[PDB]
Structures are given as C-alpha cells and as structure tokens.
Amino acid sequence: LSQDFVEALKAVVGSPHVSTASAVREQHGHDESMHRCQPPDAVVWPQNVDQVSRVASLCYNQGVPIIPFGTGTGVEGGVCAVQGGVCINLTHMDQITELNTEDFSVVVEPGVTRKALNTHLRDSGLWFPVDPGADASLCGMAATGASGTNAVRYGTMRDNVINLEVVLPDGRLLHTAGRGRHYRKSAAGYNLTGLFVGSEGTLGIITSTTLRLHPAPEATVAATCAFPSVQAAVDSTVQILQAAVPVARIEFLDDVMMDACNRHSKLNCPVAPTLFLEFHGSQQTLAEQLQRTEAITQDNGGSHFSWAAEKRNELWAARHNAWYAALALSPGSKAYSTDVCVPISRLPEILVETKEEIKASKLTGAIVGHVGDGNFACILLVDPDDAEEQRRVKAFAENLGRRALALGGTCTGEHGIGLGKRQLLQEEVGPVGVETMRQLKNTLDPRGLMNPGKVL
Ligand SMILES: Cc1cc2nc3c(=O)[nH]c(=O)nc-3n(C[C@H](O)[C@H](O)[C@H](O)COP(=O)(O)OP(=O)(O)OC[C@H]3O[C@@H](n4cnc5c(N)ncnc54)[C@H](O)[C@@H]3O)c2cc1C
Known part of the structure; x- marks a missing residue:
C-alpha cells in the first residue's frame, strides 16, 4: 500500500x-x-x-x-x-444493545462473543444457544453460518439471526430486515437476512446481528454412552431422531476422538465410540425422554448412561475443545477438517465408511460430530512441512466431500467454503447455481474486492 x-x-x-x-x-x-x-x-x-x-x-x-x-x-x-x-x-465494536427480553431478542456488535452475551444475560432467564467450541465473534458466526452442539434442538445461526446490519463493499449501510426491526416471521419482500448469513465476508461487513434468545431450560441432564462400534452409535442416533426425542445435544466421538479428549481435558471416559447427550425439560418430560432414549441406545449395545453443573460444564468444555485435543495428538501439527452433512438415513453408511477409509490410510484422523443434524467432522492432522501427507489429506477430504454429495448431502454443514471447498461447491449446486450465486456476488461487490478468492 x-x-x-x-x-x-x-x-x-x-x-x-x-x-x-x-x-x-x-x-x-x-x-x-x-x-x-x-x-x-x-x-x-x-x-x-x-x-x-x-x-x-x-x-x-x-x-x-x-x-x-x-x-x-x-x-x-x-x-x-x-x-x-x-x-x-471488527472486534473493538463490542457493545450489546437493544436487549428486548420480552421479545427474546438482542443486538450485538462484532466484538461480542457468545460467552460475553450469555454472561450479560445471567439472571435474565434467557440464553443464546448456538455454541461453536471456540469463543467466536457472534457476527463472525453469522458470517459463516455457524451451528453448534445445541443446534439440533435450538437451531443454527440461520434459524436464530433475525436481522443484520451490513456495510456493503462500497460503504453503504444496509439493515437487511429494516433498521431496528425484530419479529418472528415476515413475508415482506425478498428475505435479505438469509443471503448475508453464510456469506463469509464476500458480500459485505456485518457490523451488528440481531439474535433470537431462548428461555433457559427448566432442568438439564447430561450423560455419556459408550458403544461397541461406530455403527451402533450412529444407528442409535438415527433411531433417536426418527423417534422424535427432542434431545438438546447429541454429539458423536469415535474412539480416537474420545481418547484425544481424555488426554486433553482429564476426562476418563471409556475409550470407545461415544455419544455425549443432553436433555432439557421438566422432571416429567426428562424422565420420559431418558426412558425412550435409553431404550434405543440399549437396543444397539449402548452402556448405561454415565451421568453428569460442574461435571456437565467439564463434559461440554472437552467437547468444545475437540479441535485442540485432536491437534495435541501430534504436537506441532495443523489440521484440516471435513464437515459433510447428509440425509440422516445415510449417516450410518458414510460414518462407517469414513472410519474404514481412515483405517485403510496412513492418515491420523479423529471423528467428532453434530450427528443430530446428520453432520460430522473428520479432523485430519498434518505436519506443516510434510507436503506429501497434506496432498493425501486433501485427497481424502475431497473424496469424503464427493461421497456426501453422491448421497444427496452438502459438503459443509457449518464451517463454510472459504478456500478449501470451492470445487466441491461447484459440484454441489451445478452451473446454474454457481452463476446465480456469482450474479448476486457481482451486484453487491461489482469490483470483486470483498474478500476475494473465497467461496466462489
Ligand atoms: C475449537 C473450535 C471449535 C469450533 N466449533 C465450531 C462449531 O461447532 N460450529 C461451527 O460452525 N464452527 C465452529 N468453529 C469454526 C469457527 O469458530 C466458526 O466458523 C466461527 O463462526 C468463525 O467466527 P470468527 O469471527 O472467529 O471468524 P473469522 O475466522 O474471523 O472469519 C471467518 C470468515 O467470516 C468472515 N467474517 C468474520 N467476521 C465477519 C463480519 N463481521 N462480517 C463479515 N464477514 C465476517 C471472514 O472474512 C472469514 O471469511 C470452531 C473453531 C474452533 C477453532
């Protein structure tokens, strides 16, 4: 410059x-x-x-x-x-404003993280549920279209972003749903808010997000359940969802991930493919959910639930840090992650296949996932100086992405496209989908200066 x-x-x-x-x-x-x-x-x-x-x-x-x-x-x-x-x-703009606890809504600037917001909301009876493991900017989460362990029950960023304030590439200020507006639903014009969620900084700069808040659960029970195989854990997941149990959290860790989290967080869970589970409700509804869920896990050989406020916090902190637990298996390594999301009935095939493909390769991989959404990540850990290994990791990553596409799924449930999934996106939506997204990119960013080289 x-x-x-x-x-x-x-x-x-x-x-x-x-x-x-x-x-x-x-x-x-x-x-x-x-x-x-x-x-x-x-x-x-x-x-x-x-x-x-x-x-x-x-x-x-x-x-x-x-x-x-x-x-x-x-x-x-x-x-x-x-x-x-x-x-x-954008993080010096860190104010929470327009807290409307009677409408279950709040406005946050980019420096506000989920932890800051929920701390601000203590004793309000409300909380913000979308929970990536990292202490991330809430506006960044809107930009990436993030989800989290709670999304299976409480929705993703797309479900919980009600309005966005966006500085467009040439500096104009847009309030996607109108300045100051917040409401449960609208048919007014074209929904601009959804276009900017998941835009990754390629369509404009999110300078505030209006978020949906949720009531804190009456009561909470968390537990882990160990399984004899990946197949048994994933079949249990699909059957829990097909039985419509309104689980709050249902997270999968394969044996590699479970061991990594044990070593990184001083959990002592049996090294096995495992579900971390959480249930929300009253005492009556909790007992009903537990009894229906334990029946299904027992059918697939799940252990009796290992029950978990401070042990539950410990459990979910270890899950949230799974990325770093994986990284710790090979000190000095960086990682790439897959993030496919498939129709739930196809989740057993693709998880079991992924586990088999990891085993047949020389690659280190840990599997963790928001399986309640049909989504999972393979965290693939690489020596930054080993060029040949990274090509194998890249090749593994594309092949898994293409397998998910063959099953009618998507190459990314939550992380986004960035630099890594641009070719997969082209395959996912085809030539008319690509041209349509590009035309939308061009009207908002004619000069192509808004985070170039990403997504498209
Ligand atoms: C340990 C760990 C756990 C994670 N768990 C999850 C998880 O469960 N779910 C999940 O979805 N992700 C997860 N992530 C990924 C990451 O935390 C999310 O993608 C998050 O939304 C990124 O926010 P950020 O502000 O840190 O993004 P950045 O890395 O700063 O930016 C991400 C992208 O969004 C753009 N961007 C950022 N802020 C804005 C803005 N205000 N306006 C416009 N564009 C913007 C950037 O240009 C970039 O393209 C995890 C990451 C880690 C390290």
Whole structure:
C-alpha cells in the first residue's frame, strides 16, 4: 500500500488503529486451519460503523481488497489475504444493545462473543444457544453460518439471526430486515437476512446481528454412552431422531476422538465410540425422554448412561475443545477438517465408511460430530512441512466431500467454503447455481474486492 493510502486509513480510524507491521499482519493472515498464512498489507480496527463505512469506501474505490476479520477462529482460510489488501478487525465494536427480553431478542456488535452475551444475560432467564467450541465473534458466526452442539434442538445461526446490519463493499449501510426491526416471521419482500448469513465476508461487513434468545431450560441432564462400534452409535442416533426425542445435544466421538479428549481435558471416559447427550425439560418430560432414549441406545449395545453443573460444564468444555485435543495428538501439527452433512438415513453408511477409509490410510484422523443434524467432522492432522501427507489429506477430504454429495448431502454443514471447498461447491449446486450465486456476488461487490478468492 502507498503511504498516502495508509495515511487516509489513519485519518478515518486514528493512527493507533492502523498497522502495517509485519508481525501484526501475519497474526491476521491465517485462522485456525492449515491454510497457509497470507498476510494482509495492513490491519485496521474501526471504532464505529461510520468508520467501517469510510474504510470500506476508501478501499473499494482505490481497488484495495477488504478482508473482514472477527476472532480468526474459522477453519477454511476465510481471513487469508490471498490478494493482499486491508484486513478489517471488527472486534473493538463490542457493545450489546437493544436487549428486548420480552421479545427474546438482542443486538450485538462484532466484538461480542457468545460467552460475553450469555454472561450479560445471567439472571435474565434467557440464553443464546448456538455454541461453536471456540469463543467466536457472534457476527463472525453469522458470517459463516455457524451451528453448534445445541443446534439440533435450538437451531443454527440461520434459524436464530433475525436481522443484520451490513456495510456493503462500497460503504453503504444496509439493515437487511429494516433498521431496528425484530419479529418472528415476515413475508415482506425478498428475505435479505438469509443471503448475508453464510456469506463469509464476500458480500459485505456485518457490523451488528440481531439474535433470537431462548428461555433457559427448566432442568438439564447430561450423560455419556459408550458403544461397541461406530455403527451402533450412529444407528442409535438415527433411531433417536426418527423417534422424535427432542434431545438438546447429541454429539458423536469415535474412539480416537474420545481418547484425544481424555488426554486433553482429564476426562476418563471409556475409550470407545461415544455419544455425549443432553436433555432439557421438566422432571416429567426428562424422565420420559431418558426412558425412550435409553431404550434405543440399549437396543444397539449402548452402556448405561454415565451421568453428569460442574461435571456437565467439564463434559461440554472437552467437547468444545475437540479441535485442540485432536491437534495435541501430534504436537506441532495443523489440521484440516471435513464437515459433510447428509440425509440422516445415510449417516450410518458414510460414518462407517469414513472410519474404514481412515483405517485403510496412513492418515491420523479423529471423528467428532453434530450427528443430530446428520453432520460430522473428520479432523485430519498434518505436519506443516510434510507436503506429501497434506496432498493425501486433501485427497481424502475431497473424496469424503464427493461421497456426501453422491448421497444427496452438502459438503459443509457449518464451517463454510472459504478456500478449501470451492470445487466441491461447484459440484454441489451445478452451473446454474454457481452463476446465480456469482450474479448476486457481482451486484453487491461489482469490483470483486470483498474478500476475494473465497467461496466462489
Ligand atoms: C475449537 C473450535 C471449535 C469450533 N466449533 C465450531 C462449531 O461447532 N460450529 C461451527 O460452525 N464452527 C465452529 N468453529 C469454526 C469457527 O469458530 C466458526 O466458523 C466461527 O463462526 C468463525 O467466527 P470468527 O469471527 O472467529 O471468524 P473469522 O475466522 O474471523 O472469519 C471467518 C470468515 O467470516 C468472515 N467474517 C468474520 N467476521 C465477519 C463480519 N463481521 N462480517 C463479515 N464477514 C465476517 C471472514 O472474512 C472469514 O471469511 C470452531 C473453531 C474452533 C477453532
């Protein structure tokens, strides 16, 4: 970047909020995945929405790419500055506003994480359920279309984002559902909110998200259940869903993942393919759900439930840290993850096949998943200097993605496309789907400067 351009950035946000230092740029050139660090030319921290708009306008009109940056916990290289440009770290805008506990809604700026929001909501009787394992920006979660362990019951970001405030690439300010609006449903015009959820910073910069809040459960019971095989655990999952048990959380760990989590969190669960389960309701409904769910797990050889506030917190903290538990198996490694989501009846085939394919390869892989959604991840751990292994991991990852597509599924349930799944997306939606998404990208970002090289 030219000195005049850097000075123009400083005129918007203040000198302390622009950095061209190599170390600062490198820290903002990668996320939590193995995608190689590609440092932006500068990092900028806008202090309010007017500054976001003015930074975007400056970059856009000068032909400088823009990379929105939340907490950098993505796993598909979304923040990697493949074409250089200006990384906009949005986290200094960290206010919670418009808390409407009678309407079950709240507005959050990009610096607000789920942990911050739920802390703010203590003693309100309400909580925000969508729970990625990382302490991520809620606006970043809206940008990636995130889900979590609670999504099976409480919905994904797509289900729980009611409105978005978006700085469009040329600086215009859009409130997708209208400024200040919040409501349960609408047929008014075209739904713009859903277009920006899962847009990954390629259509605009989310500067606030209006979120649906949920009532805290009357009572909570968590447990683990060990199974003799992956087949038995996944058949149990499908049967629980087909029986319509309204489970709050149903998470799968294969034996490799279970052992990794044991070693990383001081859990002592039997090393086996395992379901972590949670149930919400009254004492009467809990007993009913438990009895129907234990009957199904027993049919498939599940252990008697190992019951788990502080043990439950310990259980879910270990699950939330599964990514790092995997990484700890091979110190110094980075990881790539698959994220397929298939029709639930096909989940047994593809999980068992994935386990068999991992075993037949020399690759280390841990399997963990939001199986209540028909979704799972294979975390594939790689030596950053071993080029040949990564090609095998990439090849394994595409082949699994294509297998999910053959089953009528999707290549990503929650993580997004970023740099890693662009070819899979083309196969998933075909030429008319690709052209339609690209036309939408072009009307919002004519110059192609809004996080270039990602998604499409
Ligand atoms: C341990 C661990 C566990 C995880 N568990 C889950 C899980 O259960 N479910 C899940 O879905 N993901 C999970 N993730 C992935 C990641 O946390 C989510 O994708 C999260 O939504 C990323 O948010 P972020 O702000 O950290 O993203 P970043 O890495 O900062 O950015 C991600 C992408 O979104 C864009 N972006 C970020 N903020 C904005 C914004 N305000 N406006 C526009 N674009 C923006 C970026 O340009 C980039 O393309 C996990 C990650 C880790 C490390």
